[PDB]
Amino acid sequence: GSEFRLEAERMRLAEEEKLRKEMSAKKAKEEAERKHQERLAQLAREDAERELKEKEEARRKKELLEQMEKA
């Protein structure tokens, strides 16, 4: 029986091994897509706040100059 128990213990170890090799892959494919989406929303936000400052920095200096022209 020893050689048959050796073979079923060896098989269970290879199995635990390849789980480890593949929960490891799942995590890294989950993290890749995390920095991806975080990077894509960061860029979407900076762009909206740059857009918005430019829009309102302009409006303000518009209303400013037009009150200045009132003299």
Swiss-Prot record:
Cellular compartments annotated: Cytoplasm; Cytoplasm, Cell cortex; Cytoplasm, Cytoskeleton; Synapse
Assembly with partners or alone: Might homodimerize in a two headed molecule through the formation of a coiled-coil rod. Identified in a complex with USH1C and USH1G. Interacts with MYRIP. Interacts with RPE65. Interacts with CIB2. May interact with CALM. Interacts with WHRN. Interacts with PLEKHB1 (via PH domain). Interacts with PCDH15. Interacts with TWF2. Interacts with USH1G. Interacts with MYH9. Interacts (via MyTH4-FERM domains) with cytoplasmic regions of ADGRV1 and USH2A. Interacts with PDZD7 (via MyTH4-FERM domains). Interacts with CALML4.
Protein encoded by which gene: Myo7a
Tissue expression per record: Detected in mechanosensory stereocilia of cochlea hair cells (at protein level). Expressed in the retina, cochlea, kidney and liver.
Its biological purpose: Myosins are actin-based motor molecules with ATPase activity. Unconventional myosins serve in intracellular movements. Their highly divergent tails bind to membranous compartments, which are then moved relative to actin filaments. In the retina, plays an important role in the renewal of the outer photoreceptor disks. Plays an important role in the distribution and migration of retinal pigment epithelial (RPE) melanosomes and phagosomes, and in the regulation of opsin transport in retinal photoreceptors. Mediates intracellular transport of RPE65 in the retina pigment epithelium.
Segment of the intact protein contained: 866 to 932 of 2215
Pathological association: Defects in Myo7a are the cause of the shaker-1 (sh-1) phenotype which affects only the inner ear. Sh-1 homozygote mutants show hyperactivity, head tossing and circling due to vestibular dysfunction, together with typical neuroepithelial-type cochlear defects involving dysfunction and progressive degeneration of the organ of Corti.
Name of the featured protein: Unconventional myosin-VIIa
Similarity-based family: Belongs to the TRAFAC class myosin-kinesin ATPase superfamily. Myosin family.
Comment field on protein domains: The SAH (single alpha-helix) region is characterized by a high content of charged residues which are predicted to stabilize the alpha-helical structure by ionic bonds.
Chain positions covered by the region annotation SAH: 5-71
